[PDB]
């Protein structure tokens, strides 16, 4: 099994509703930590991490994010000047993380930055050079390519620190991080007009669900796509057009790595 530890940072312009800075941490598909510019502390979103991490962990994680908080705000002003934008609603985003592989394989890592939800700058870990598809990133790229300690440090995090803690998290959140199978329903709905296959309560989000008419695969099928529930699990509805009197047998087939064997359900 592949596993990941990823962080998502969002800086928003001082404005309505949303805190000026919000960061979230994920092990695989499960959110486990949160920080925002109102509370100004890194807090658990999972019990396993709350139980297994002492005062020093939360103290340090809070301090780290406190450094990130002003940084991104400064960024929004810097990039507005660079793009000659002067006001309005603006965003900075940062994505970084690592992936651990047992099947194979070479470990991966990434750090990606975005300005107003468009590619700003990111690191090529293999070449150890920063890439930018825009002119307003070039001046940052030239500074960041020079900065050895920054570059090697970031690389050390993605390849070393990130992987190491991910491994600790996988041990400490072991049962909590296990896949949970979908509970699936296959029933006539909307006054017997449509036949709907609904899978709910599954984790992680990734899922295959296909409909079959009398051993044949059904195209022209309607799907909500995977969407979150309230408890860290996910759901999906796939439905097709129907007749209640018809002779042909209908089946719904589900693939989820919480199943470990293909699951079929008949009408």
């Amino acid at each position: 099994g592949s596993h990941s530890l990823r962080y998502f940072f969002t800086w928003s312009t001082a404005g309505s509703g949303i805190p000026e800075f919000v960061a979230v941490g994920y092990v695989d598909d499960q959110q486990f930590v949160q920080y925002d510019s109102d509370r100004k502390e890194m807090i658990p979103r999972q019990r396993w991490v709350k139980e297994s991490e002492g005062p020093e962990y939360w103290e340090r994680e809070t301090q780290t994010l406190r450094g990130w908080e002003p940084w991104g705000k400064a960024n929004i002003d810097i990039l507005s000047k660079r793009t000659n934008q002067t006001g309005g609603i603006h965003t900075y985003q940062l994505m970084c993380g690592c992936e651990l592989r047992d099947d194979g394989s070479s470990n991966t890592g990434f750090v990606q930055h975005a300005w107003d939800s468009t590619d700003f700058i990111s690191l090529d870990k293999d070449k150890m050079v920063w890439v930018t598809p825009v002119t307003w990133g070039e001046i940052t790229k030239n500074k960041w390519d020079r900065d050895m300690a920054f570059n090697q440090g970031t690389k050390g995090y993605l390849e070393g620190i990130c992987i190491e803690w991910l491994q600790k998290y996988l041990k400490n959140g072991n049962v909590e991080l296990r896949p949970v199978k979908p509970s699936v329903t296959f029933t006539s709905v909307r006054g017997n007009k449509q036949l709907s296959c609904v899978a709910t309560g599954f984790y992680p989000h990734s899922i295959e669900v296909n409909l079959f008419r009398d051993s044949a695969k059904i195209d022209e099928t309607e799907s909500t796509g995977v969407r979150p529930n309230h408890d860290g699990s996910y759901q999906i509805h796939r439905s097709t057009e129907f007749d209640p009197n018809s002779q042909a047998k209908y089946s719904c087939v589900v693939d989820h790595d919480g199943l470990g064997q293909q699951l079929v359900v008949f009408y």
Binding site: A23, G25, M42, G67, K143, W144
Partner: peptide, 9 residues
């Protein structure tokens, strides 16, 4: 464990 390597733009 959050990344802590921060450098100005």
């Amino acid at each position: 464990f959050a990344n802590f390597f921060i450098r100005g733009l």
